[PDB]
Design an enzyme around this catalytic site. Structure first.
Site, PDB file in Angstrom:
ATOM      1  N   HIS A  87       0.824  -1.214   0.000  1.00  0.00           N
ATOM      2  CA  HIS A  87       0.000   0.000   0.000  1.00  0.00           C
ATOM      3  C   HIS A  87       0.861   1.269   0.000  1.00  0.00           C
ATOM      4  CE1 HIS A  87      -3.656  -2.383   1.757  1.00  0.00           C
ATOM      5  NE2 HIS A  87      -3.627  -2.441   0.441  1.00  0.00           N
ATOM      6  N   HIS A 150      -3.868  -7.831   7.584  1.00  0.00           N
ATOM      7  CA  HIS A 150      -4.255  -6.601   6.900  1.00  0.00           C
ATOM      8  C   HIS A 150      -4.110  -6.724   5.386  1.00  0.00           C
ATOM      9  CE1 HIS A 150      -4.306  -2.370   5.879  1.00  0.00           C
ATOM     10  NE2 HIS A 150      -3.193  -2.611   5.217  1.00  0.00           N
TER      11      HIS A 150
END
Ligand code: XM8
Ligand code: ZN
Ligand code: ZN
Length: 232
Positions: A87, A150
């Site tokens: 990310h 995550h």
């Protein structure tokens, strides 16, 4: 003035450092994403007369500001960086690092996901981390792959000299009431991955989340609790 920094002390574009232990700092920056402002953490670990960086400061300009803040506060060169998943809060700024001479690293899983998403891509692949429970040494830290949480590629980082556990975005802060951005998460596997972290690092003294305030080992159980409640 000594408390852990928050956005109210961090305009987007500025970076603060926080001393965690001898030779260990976190870095804190803020960024806008889909019309909201968020803080995010990374790590800096002294590596003799060099520094190892964990994660960018979430964006090119933030990461340039991070390098300037390190020069002001620490004054040792950042020579290597590891990004703990794909990310933007982990790899956004890798191009800035690479143009400043920093060698950038991530697992092959992270590199593939970054490339497929159009995010910045660390240069070097970290082998030996593809199975859950895997660990490798990287300078003054151990990198550990706990399993999907995550994200499928998330790594955690342990600083053995200081018993500091940097959980990255697989670990949430104690005040959190939700599991954050779960778009790429595995909510069913996440508690098992957290249990693996707990079993592997039972002597951790400081636990640092990807976003928000450090604390102790309680952050791990709290993360499992908030994830299980999000899933349900
Ligand atoms: C840069 C990253 O990209 C993720 C992403 C994924 C998929 C797509 C689609 N391809 C696009 C982007 C990103 C962006 C924006 C937010 C987050 C959050 C986040 C969310 C809510 C809260 C609670 S809060 C402060 O609002 O009360 C917290 Cl703590 C953290 C996390 C995180 O959980 O790690 N990661 C975030
Ligand atoms: Zn993430
Ligand atoms: Zn995150």
């Amino acid at each position: 003035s000594g408390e852990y920094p928050t956005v109210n002390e961090i305009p987007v574009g500025e970076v603060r450092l926080y001393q965690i232990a001898d030779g260990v700092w976190s870095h804190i920056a803020t960024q806008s994403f889909d019309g909201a402002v968020y803080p995010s953490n990374g790590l800096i670990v002294r590596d003799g007369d060099e520094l190892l960086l964990i994660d960018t400061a979430w964006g090119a300009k933030n990461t340039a500001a991070l390098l300037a803040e390190i020069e002001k506060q620490i004054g040792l060169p950042v020579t290597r960086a590891v990004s703990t998943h794909f990310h933007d809060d982990r790899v956004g700024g890798v191009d800035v690092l690479r143009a400043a001479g920093v060698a950038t690293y991530a697992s092959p899983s992270t590199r593939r996901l970054a490339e497929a998403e159009g995010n910045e891509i660390p240069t070097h692949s970290l082998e030996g981390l593809s199975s859950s429970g895997d660990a490798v040494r990287f300078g003054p830290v151990e990198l550990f792959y706990p399993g999907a949480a995550h994200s499928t590629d998330n790594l955690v980082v342990y600083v053995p000299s200081a018993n500091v556990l940097y959980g990255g975005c697989a670990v949430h802060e104690l005040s959190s009431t939700s599991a954050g951005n779960v778009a790429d998460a595995d909510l069913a596997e996440w508690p098992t991955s957290v249990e693996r972290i707990q079993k592997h690092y039972p002597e951790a003294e400081v636990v640092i989340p990807g976003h928000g305030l450090p604390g102790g080992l309680d952050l791990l159980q709290h993360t499992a609790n908030v994830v299980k409640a999000h899933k349900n």
